[PDB]
Amino acid sequence: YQVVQPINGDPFIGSLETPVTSSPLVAWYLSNLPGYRTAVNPLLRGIEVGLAHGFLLVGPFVKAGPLRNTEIAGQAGSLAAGGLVVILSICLTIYGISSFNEGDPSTAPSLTLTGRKKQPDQLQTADGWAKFTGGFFFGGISGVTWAFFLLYVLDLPYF
Amino acid sequence: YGDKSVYFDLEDLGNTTGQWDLYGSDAPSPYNSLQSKFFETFAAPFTKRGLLLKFLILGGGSTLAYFSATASGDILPIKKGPQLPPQLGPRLG
Amino acid sequence: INLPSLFVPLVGLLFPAVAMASLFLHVEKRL
Amino acid sequence: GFTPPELDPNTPSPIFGGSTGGLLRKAQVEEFYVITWESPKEQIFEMPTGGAAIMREGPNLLKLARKEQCLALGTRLRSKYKIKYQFYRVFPSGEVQYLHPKDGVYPEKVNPGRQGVGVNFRSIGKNVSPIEVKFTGKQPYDL
Amino acid sequence: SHSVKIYDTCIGCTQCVRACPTDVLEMIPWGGCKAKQIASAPRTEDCVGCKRCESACPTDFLSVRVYLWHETTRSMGLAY
Amino acid sequence: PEVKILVDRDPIKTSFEQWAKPGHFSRTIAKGPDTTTWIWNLHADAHDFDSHTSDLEEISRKVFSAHFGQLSIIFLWLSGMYFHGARFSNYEAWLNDPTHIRPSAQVVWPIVGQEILNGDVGGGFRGIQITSGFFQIWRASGITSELQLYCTAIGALVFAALMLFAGWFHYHKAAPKLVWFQDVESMLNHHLAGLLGLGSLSWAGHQVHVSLPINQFLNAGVDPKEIPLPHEFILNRDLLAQLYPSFAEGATPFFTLNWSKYADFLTFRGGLDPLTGGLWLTDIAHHHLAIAILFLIAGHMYRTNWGIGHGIKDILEAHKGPFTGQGHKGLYEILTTSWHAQLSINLAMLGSLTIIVAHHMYAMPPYPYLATDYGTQLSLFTHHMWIGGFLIVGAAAHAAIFMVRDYDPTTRYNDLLDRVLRHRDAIISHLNWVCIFLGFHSFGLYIHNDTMSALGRPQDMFSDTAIQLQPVFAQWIQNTHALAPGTTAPGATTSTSLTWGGGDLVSVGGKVALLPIPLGTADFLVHHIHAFTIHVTVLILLKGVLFARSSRLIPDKANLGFRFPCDGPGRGGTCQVSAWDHVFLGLFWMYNAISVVIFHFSWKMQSDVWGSINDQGVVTHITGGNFAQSSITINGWLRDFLWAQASQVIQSYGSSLSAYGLFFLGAHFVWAFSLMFLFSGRGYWQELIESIVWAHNKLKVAPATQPRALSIVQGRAVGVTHYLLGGIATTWAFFLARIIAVG
Amino acid sequence: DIAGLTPCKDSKQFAKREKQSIKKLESSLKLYAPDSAPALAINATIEKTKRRFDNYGKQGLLCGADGLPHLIVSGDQRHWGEFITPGILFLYIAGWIGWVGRSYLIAIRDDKKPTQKEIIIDVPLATGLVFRGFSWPIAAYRELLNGELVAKDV
Ligand code: CLA
Ligand code: CLA
Ligand code: CLA
Ligand code: CLA
Ligand code: CLA
Ligand code: CLA
Ligand SMILES: CC1=C(/C=C/C(C)=C/C=CC(/C)=C/C=C/C=C(C)\C=C\C=C(C)\C=C\C2=C(C)CCCC2(C)C)C(C)(C)CCC1
Ligand code: SF4
Ligand code: SF4
Ligand code: SF4
């Protein structure tokens, strides 16, 4: 019994099969993330990603920021998180504009792990990526607003 | 491809070169229609490349300008200004 | 109204951001 | 004039346990190379990318991502094991291109069916100075 | 693609051909020396610019010269 | 199968024929010199036995004889030490009053005004103060007069002669055969038991009879010349009975298993001796006794001739699991046919061991009057640290040499090595990520503190008074160590070391020997810096070893060899792709890491440990505890450490320490000189040498041996050698001057 | 005097430095026994310092405001002992060395393997050649005049 195997049994592709790389639970978890929901509208996946990330970013800015001790710690940190979300939206938009064209199909792989055809993920198109990045921006702003509202605006004892 | 030990065929180059998606779902939307019907309707105006880029750039610029030009004294010590008398140099001043 | 307060962010944050975005778009795409 | 051998899929590939030095996206979108040999007996050889692999009995086919890798593998097969080899260039369109040995005889041995390319009929010290080829698209050695 | 040139001082020793690590050089029939051989460079598009051929040439100055030129993915030796 | 003695008679006849021919080993070298490059090559491959030939037997015989020669050199060095201590030293004056006199065992003749270096070291003596710590060793051994030192020097000279003769005899008269060298089971059995265990038993026996009674008399206050000679304590046993009553019964407790009766001189106290400031000698004797038992038992593991024992092949091949295939199968054949594999393993282990030796030796000082000899402590720590670092880098060098030369899967195949070579890309990528992450968070915090301090925002700094980064784990571990005696280790009275805690400061002669070392935010930051540097140097060395044979850039890198300049400017440029160049870079990074480690040790010791005790018990530390608050910024390291402590060395002119200032400046010069070689290429130098050679040709004074510029690899080697010499020597001068003037 | 300096013999800072040096040396002497080896060494060093300063004053060196001797190399005949006659001595010795080495190189240049006699010095020939450097000033002069010092055709 050996645990590590070559990719799909093909030993000449630069990768391996390992419990970390390909275990049942890990594979399921990775496939169930918005980035890998190929058959879903890119806008909704972007919404989910943006919500998660915007809510994430508020904490470090608020607690570790230069105005953490000041009474306006929540406001300052939330504004910083929103600004970072805006900059990330700028980065996404320029990446999509530079890396995609309207008249080209999706650059995503068209084959699955068993060798059967499937519609390439539309996220890697021009308008698909535009929808995904718009959804990400909206979700990020919403997540920052929610995290800011959850604290400070409402007490809610934490820590 | 994959007959026994063969790992090459011109008929299917995509499989031969390992052009798979290790984690693509190929599953239907986990969201119910109602939630998507709201998100796709309220987040619609932000899904244009040029429009979104221009709006983001100018809106962020105006927001930064407004927030920096109207900062309160407890925010930035730079603009609150000095609060002590100035010292003299060794001979200048 | 403090003229430096308006311009320092404008030239240190807005201007580099827009310039880098524009130049990345120009340098990084087929014409 | 030496019909180049046609690449034959279904030929077994060498026994290998997998590696992180294999193909990448360049093979998927640009090109990759395939080398074939015979190897009279099953034996273990050093891969050009990772550890050790075993050549199967009879024909063997190996796909590499670089032509230089194919040449190194062919050199080892030719000098260590005394095996005859040929490798191809495969494009994503499905094209195959016989590469080496181009005319059935290795490039080391002179063949009466080769024309000269990039041969200058003068010593290297008789090239014009750059000033004579300035503002013309040519280079002093291209003349 | 780098530019490889063979000059008429070549003595057809074949040492450059043995050295090329991408099969760029060849031996072709010729009549100006005892070996009736001279080097050729018909596949310079696969040249990586290693200049390993020049290190093997016994003539002085060299009979094979490699001039590095425009770089391609083949000339840069990139596997990705 | 059996273990026996195998040799060959008169393999090489001693003669002078090959002396007259420079470079007999290589045929082309034997032919003669064509260019000056030849000369350098002759030295670059002097000890590369495996390249001059391919027979394992000849390589093994040469290695054995060279070992004998080096052992002879070491013995000569030790004999010189003992002779200098005997004649040109103030050892007896120091013995009468240790804390009062500064040890010295070197005088300089008065020739060009250099006699200023013969400084006032005390004890009616003028010489150069020595930081090697030999006086403490001799005191701990029981040496009281110079007759004993003279006898030891003569004996060491005789043993050096014996080692030299043994080397000659074994290479030229009786050379062991290959099967003799390949017998590793008996070798391990003898070294574990015959050498280490038996040697430790012998040293314990000496300590029981000579060290203990002599040091007890010395600590009782008896003048050294009035003490009975070490042999008397053996003739008349009541001499020992007086100091320790349990010697009265004599051996019968040992044979009736009434070993408790030996508790008088075989103790488990721990801590330091309050009088001398070192470990209890009754603890060291027991230490060596227990070590002797353990090694004499461990040296009975491997089977040699009588069936009982372990076959190393069986042990290796019995280990293998689902994640490693058939791992450990074939390693025995690899490690008994390649010398470079063994050399790399042993070099790594010896380097780590030397580093551990430094750590443990300043942790709990083992020699009397060593803790308060601050110069000795600092010098010993720094010396052992550098030696260990160099040995570790050599480990990587020789692992790469083996990989290029002796690794062969067709005949000697190993599974673990194959799997490592197959996922080297993942290994190196993750190591690279770890290096980047550590570099950002360790050094980035320093830059953050510096920027905050410059902007007048000390409240935002990562300090003990602003944002604390307390090493909770280290604090917990040392707290558990402090509580250890009487709780988890009942038989010990004092903790292992006084750095753990528990208070009980120990001082000698008005100077602090040791006291608890506190760990704070600065310690956290410097420890993470250490981790970062070690990881980066490991990255360089491991990448050099793993990618020695091939890579995605040059798929046939092994065919070029272990040492070579490049593979041309193709593929964008293939400069420094060989494993030797990876060792060359690892040298720079090892220098960086060890320099930071020794700087941390020196500053922490001066700030929080070393110092002077007073009547009320108020400790005044050499540096008034500024490490905790000043070491958290780069400006503090530049100001409160380098600038502040360089005053001692730069001022040394006009005194006995002027040599240290001279060496300071000279080391700076040599280091800056190295950059000449590290930054340039040999093409420019060859072109310049062309014009020089023409100028010589114009006067009929051109050399016949054509003067070529140095090879590329030689340029790199010269650059790194000069860089290391200059840096290490300037640090050496700085440390020695600072600690001798302030200590 | 020259360059505004004054003779060391009548200079004052020179004498002050001399006194300070001797005082510094004597400070260490009083610590040891009057007639021990360290005391004898320190006394010898003090005597050496006194002799050095007296000799510097005797030879007529120039001392600046710093109180240290300064060397005049303009060519003034009052100071030829500072740079010019030592310079002539150096030129003689260095030409000796260079001429001897060149003679050796020219002598061994005729063998089939001259490099062998370069990494292994042919001492027998070298001992005969080294003495030509006594008269190299004449040999080189006539070598130049005769026109074979410099390799023609180059
Ligand atoms: C060159 C121009 C420039 C300018 C004008 C600023 C200005 C500022 N910096 Mg920055 N910085 C710069 C360069 C600059 N920085 C560079 C080159 C570096 C790299 C070394 C940094 C590294 C740095 C760090 C690590 C931090 C700052 C912080 C800050 C803020 C501290 C004062 C404060 O508390 O205000 C008010 C505090 C707030 C939290 C309000 C946030 C600012 C506005 C309201 C956000 C709105 C953004 C808006 C949507 C536009 C997006 C950008 C768009 C123009 C593209 C301040 C607004 C600190 C900070 O505040 O964290 C964010 C801080 O942690 N700077
Ligand atoms: C090359 C000359 C020069 C230089 C080195 C600077 C440097 C500086 N200026 Mg200034 N400025 C200049 C010319 C210059 N200025 C001119 C000609 C004017 C109009 C009279 C101004 C008006 C001005 C104002 C109102 C302010 C500054 C301020 C500042 C400081 C902060 C950064 C900033 O606000 O950006 C500069 C802001 C501008 C509005 C500049 C616009 C004017 C020129 C024509 C722009 C040049 C752009 C051009 C494409 C690049 C020039 C070539 C090369 C240098 C790249 C900074 C030290 C701020 C300050 O006071 O510091 C606290 C501030 O508020 N400047
Ligand atoms: C005492 C007389 C003697 C004589 C006449 C010879 C003669 C010979 N030996 Mg030998 N040998 C001797 C003693 C002797 N050996 C001893 C005592 C040892 C034990 C170390 C050896 C071990 C030995 C080995 C392993 C080998 C020889 C070899 C040889 C032959 C090759 C040339 C040679 O010697 O190397 C050159 C002569 C030298 C003097 C080189 C210097 C070596 C010394 C040890 C350096 C000293 C280190 C120094 C302290 C370093 C610090 C530098 C500092 C001073 C700046 C030659 C016929 C070689 C051979 O036979 O090739 C097949 C061979 O491999 N010998
Ligand atoms: C790596 C070194 C380092 C570190 C740790 C810090 C840390 C800090 N700096 Mg700082 N700084 C640094 C270097 C560093 N700096 C350098 C080199 C400079 C230039 C000289 C500055 C200049 C600077 C300024 C001017 C200021 C700071 C400030 C701060 C504080 C707030 C910054 C902030 O909120 O940003 C944003 C933080 C985040 C966006 C968090 C991202 C990182 C997350 C938490 C980790 C993600 C990994 C995650 C665990 C992975 C798990 C994956 C899993 C979930 C799947 C903070 C404690 C501000 C301050 O007020 O100090 C108190 C301030 O104004 N810094
Ligand atoms: C009691 C048995 C014994 C002892 C004590 C030693 C001791 C030693 N061996 Mg050794 N060895 C042994 C058995 C033993 N060996 C056997 C049975 C074999 C065959 C398998 C080997 C094969 C072997 C090799 C191949 C090498 C050693 C080496 C060494 C030295 C290692 C360096 C060191 O630590 O220096 C410690 C220094 C001292 C302890 C100083 C005192 C030295 C005394 C005089 C050694 C005498 C022991 C010797 C075995 C006596 C037999 C010879 C007799 C006819 C006179 C060391 C002195 C290495 C070496 O050459 O040394 C540099 C080495 O290359 N040994
Ligand atoms: C017991 C330890 C040990 C042993 C037995 C060896 C043995 C060997 N090593 Mg090795 N090595 C070691 C440790 C060791 N090494 C360590 C610790 C390092 C890291 C620094 C290295 C790094 C290393 C490299 C990079 C290489 C070797 C090589 C070799 C082989 C040939 C060495 C040679 O003769 O070249 C000639 C030796 C010299 C010219 C001597 C160098 C003189 C040094 C630089 C001067 C030292 C200056 C001094 C300390 C202070 C100044 C004094 C001065 C002012 C007078 C040989 C088998 C070479 C090889 O090819 O392997 C097969 C090679 O490439 N080693
Ligand atoms: C007087 C004086 C001075 C000055 C001077 C001058 C400035 C002049 C000059 C000069 C010059 C202007 C010189 C020149 C030269 C030139 C040439 C051209 C040469 C040559 C030579 C040679 C070439 C040689 C060779 C040799 C020899 C002889 C030696 C050995 C061998 C040999 C071979 C190496 C002063 C004031 C400072 C000071 C005082 C003194
Ligand atoms: S430079 Fe290298 S790859 Fe190019 S022709 Fe010469 S040997 Fe071949
Ligand atoms: S190495 Fe030089 S001389 Fe020999 S065949 Fe090639 S070009 Fe001609
Ligand atoms: S610069 Fe030197 S090391 Fe780099 S490719 Fe050129 S010859 Fe090789």
Q: How many angstroms away from the CA of F699 is the closest CA of chain E?
A: 27
Alpha helices in A68-125 (DSSP H): 73-99
Q: Which residues of E are annotated as a binding site for [4Fe-4S] cluster?
A: 10, 13, 16, 20, 47, 50, 53, 57
Angle at A145 between CA A141 and CA A151, to 5 degrees: 150
Neighbour-count burial of F324, counting CB atoms closer than 10 A to its CB (0-12 exposed, 13-18 middle, 19+ buried): middle
Using CB atoms within 10 Å of the CB of residue B79, give its burial: 0 to 12 exposed, 13 to 18 middle, 19+ buried.
Answer: middle
Q: CA-CA distances (angstroms) from residue F699 to F56, F702, G105, G140?
A: 52, 8, 11, 12
Indicate if ligand 5 lies below 6 Å from the C-beta of F186. yes
Burial status of residue F581 (CB atoms within 10 A of its CB: 0-12, 13-18, 19 or more): buried
Alpha-carbon gap: F709 to the closest alpha carbon of chain G (Å): 18
In this structure, are residues F381 and F361 in contact, taking their beta carbons and an 8 Å threshold?
Answer: yes
Q: How many Cβ contacts (< 8 angstroms) between chains A and F? A: 14
Which chain A residues are Cβ-neighbours of C21 within 8 angstroms? 90, 94
Q: Which domain holds residue A144?
A: 5-150
Question: Which has the closest alpha carbon to A94: E52, C27, D76, F619?
Answer: C27
| Residue that the structure tokens 């395939």 belong to | D34
* Contact in structure between F154 and F693 (CB atoms under 8 Å): no
Q: How far apart are CA F381 and CA F355, in angstroms?
A: 9
The pocket around ligand 10, CB under 6 angstroms, is made up of F 565-566, 568-569, 573-575, 681, 712
**Can you state the percent helix, strand and coil of chain E, rounding each to 5?**
15, 20, 65
Question: CB–CB of A12 and D13 under 8 A?
Answer: yes
Nearest to F539 by CA among F582, F574, F577, F580: F582
Token look-up 């001790």 returns A69
G77 is in an annotated binding site: yes
Every domain of chain D and the residues it spans: 1-143
Cα–Cα distance for residue pair D20/A12, rounded to 1 Å: 9
Q: Which two tokens stand for residue B52?
A: 């979104």
Name the nearest CA neighbour of F422 among A30, B15, G131, D19.
D19
- Whether B74 and chain A come into contact, CB under 8 Å, resolves to yes
Distance C13 CA to ligand 1 centre (A): 8
Test D52 with F409 for CB contact under 8 angstroms: yes
Pairing type for strands F506-508 and F174-176 reads unpaired
Omega before residue D101 within 30° of 0, cis: yes
Ligand 9 centroid from CA E11, angstroms = 6
∠ CA F4-F6-F7, rounded to 5°:
160
For residues E1 and E72, the answer to whether their CB atoms sit within 8 Å is yes
Residue F394: CB partners within 8 Å, gap ≥ 6? F344, F347, F351
Contacts of G147 (CB under 8 A, 6+ apart): none
Q: How far is CA F74 from CA F80, F140, F148, in A?
A: 10, 22, 20
Ranges of H-type helices in chain G: 12-29, 37-59, 80-107, 116-119, 123-130, 136-145
Report which DSSP code applies to F402: H
Q: Which of D16, D84, D8 is nearest to D48 (CA)?
A: D16
Chains D and G touch, contact meaning at least 3 pairs of CB atoms under 8 angstroms apart: no
Resolution value (Å, 1 decimal): 2.7
CB contact under 8 A, A1 and F322: yes
- Which neighbouring-strand residues pair with G6? G63
CA–CA distances in Å: residue F389 to residues B66, F399, F543, F589, F734: 57, 16, 18, 10, 20
Q: Provide the residue count of chain F.
A: 743
- Report the DSSP beta bridge partners of residue F621: F611
Q: List the one residue out of E57, E44, E19, F690 whose CA is nearest residue D141.
A: E44
What is the number of other CB atoms lying within 10 angstroms of the CB of residue E27? Answer: 25
Max distance between CA atoms of chain D, in angstroms, equals 62
d(CA G28, CA F119): 10
F261, F253 contact by CB (below 8 A):
yes
Instruction: Output phi, psi for A107, to 5 deg.
Output: -85, 0
Contact across the interface for A94 and C21, Cβ inside 8 Å = yes
Residue nearest to atom 62 of ligand 2 (CA): C4
Name the residue of F6, F67, F188, F195 whose CB sits within 8 Å of the most ligand 5 atoms, as the mutation to test its pocket. F195
Please enumerate, as own/partner, the contacts of F619-626 that have beta carbons within 8 Å and a separation of 24 or more.
F619/F505, F619/F512, F619/F515, F621/F512, F622/F742, F622/F743
Helix (H) or strand (E) holding F38: helix F36-44
Residue of F419, F460, F467 to mutate for A, most A C-beta atoms under 10 A: F460
Q: Do the beta carbons of residue A42 and residue A105 sit within 8 Å?
A: no
Is the Cβ pair A109, B20 closer than 8 Å? yes
**Three-class secondary structure assignment of A140-157:** HHHHHHHHHHHHHHCCCC
The C-alpha atoms of residue F219 and residue F285 are separated, in whole angstroms, by 17
Which H/E stretch holds residue F279?
none
Residue E29 domain boundaries? 1-80
* Residue A25 in tokens: 């639970």
Does the beta-carbon distance from E75 to F571 stay under 8 Å?
yes
Q: How far apart are CA A93 and CA A80, in angstroms?
A: 20
Residues in chain G: 154
> Which numbered ligand comes closest to the C-alpha of E16?
9
Which contacts qualify for F258-261: CB closer than 8 Å, 24 or more apart? none
Among chain F residues, the shortest Cα distance to A65 is held by F460
Please tell me whether F535 is known to bind a ligand: yes
C21 lines ligand 2 (CB under 6 A): no
Residue F509 makes CB contacts below 8 A (sequence gap 6+) with F98, F99, F100, F372
From the list D18, D19, D22, the residue facing A5 with the nearest CB is D18
CB-count burial class (<10 Å; 0-12, 13-18, 19+) for B11: exposed
Query: Which chain E residue has its CA at the smallest distance from D126's CA?
Result: E7
Q: Which method resolved this structure? A: cryo-EM
Tokens linked to D137: 């698209």
Helix (H, G, I), strand (E, B) or coil at A78: helix
CA atoms of F560 and F558, how far apart (whole Å)? 5
Radius of gyration of chain G (CA): 26
CB count in 10 Å sphere of residue G44: 12
Which residues of chain C does A94 touch, with a Cβ-Cβ cutoff of 8 Å?
21, 24-25
3-state SS assignment for residue F607: helix
d(CA F718, CA F722): 6
- Grouping H, G, I as helix, E, B as strand and the rest as coil, residue B24 is coil
* Among the listed residues F625, F431, F454, F613, the one whose alpha carbon sits nearest the alpha carbon of residue F534: F431
Q: Which residue, judged by its Cα, is nearest atom 63 of ligand 3?
A: F62
Distance, CA of D1 to chain centre? 20
> Residue for token digits 């014409």?
C31
Partners of E7 in the beta sheet? Answer: D120
Could you tell me the distance, in angstroms and rounded to a whole number, from the CA of residue F708 to the centre of ligand 10? 17
Q: Which spans in E15-76 are helix H?
A: 15-19
By three-state DSSP, how is residue F125 classified?
Answer: coil
Residue pair D87/D7 in contact by the 8 Å Cβ criterion = no
Closest CA to F600 of F731, F470, F505: F731
Q: How far is CA D113 from CA B27, D84, F423, F433, F494, in A?
A: 59, 21, 45, 54, 92
Residue F438 burial (CB < 10 Å; 0-12/13-18/19+)? buried
Chains A and G touch each other (3 or more Cβ pairs < 8 A): no
Spatial distance between the Cα atoms of F558 and F405, rounded to a whole number of angstroms = 8
Q: Are F668 and F726 in contact (CB under 8 A)?
A: yes
| DSSP run (H or E) holding D35 | strand D32-37
Is the Cβ of E48 closer than 8 Å to some Cβ of chain D? yes
Give the separation between CA E57 and CA E20, rounded to whole angstroms.
12
Tell me if F460 and A1 make a contact (CB, 8 A cut-off): no
Ligand 5 site, residue F672, Cβ cutoff 6 A: no
Q: Give me the residue from F552, F556, F569 closest to E21, CB to CB.
A: F556
CB contact under 8 A, E76 and F567: no
Distance of CA E24 to the CA centre of its chain: 6
Ligand (nearest to CA of G144):
7
Asked if B touches E (at least 3 Cβ pairs < 8 angstroms), the answer reads no
In 3D space, the residue among D90, D30, D81, D82 whose CA is nearest the CA of residue D62 turns out to be: D90
Integer Cα distance of B38 and B44 in angstroms: 10
d(CA F116, CA F660): 13
Collapsing DSSP to helix, strand or coil, G4 comes out as: helix
**Chain A residues whose beta carbon lies within 8 Å of the beta carbon of residue B67:** 79
Residue E22 Cβ < 6 Å to ligand 8: yes
**Residue F29, amino acid:** I
Annotated binding residue F150:
no
Structural domain contains residue A121: yes
Strand E3-7 and strand D119-120: the pairing is parallel
- Burial class of G140 by CB neighbour count within 10 A (0 to 12, 13 to 18, 19+): middle
Q: What share of chain C is helix, strand, coil (3-state, %, to 5)?
A: 80, 0, 20
Residue F214, phi-psi category: left (phi > 0), alpha (psi -120 to 50), beta (remainder): alpha
CATH number, position A118: 1.20.1240.10
Number of Cβ within a 10 Å radius of residue F515: 21
F311 phi, psi to nearest 5 deg: -85, 120
- Tokens of residue F453, six digits: 């301090």
For A103-137, b/e burial (b = at least 16 CB within 10 A) is eeebebbbbbeeeeeeebbbbbbbebbbbbbbbbb
Contacting chains of C (3 CB pairs or more, <8 Å) are A, B
Are A96 and B67 in contact (CB < 8 Å)?
Answer: no
CB D41 within 8 A of CB D83: no
Which of F279, F278, F282 lies closest to F263 in space, CA to CA?
A: F282
Give the chain D residue nearest B9 (alpha carbons). D9
β-pair partners for D90: D32, D96
Report the residue from A4, A13, A16 with minimal CB separation from D23: A13
> F423 among the known binding-site residues?
no
Which residues lie closer than 8 Å to A151 by C-beta, 6 or more apart?
A62, A74, A158
Look at chain E and report how many structural domains it folds into. 1
Query: E76 is written with which tokens?
Result: 């840069």
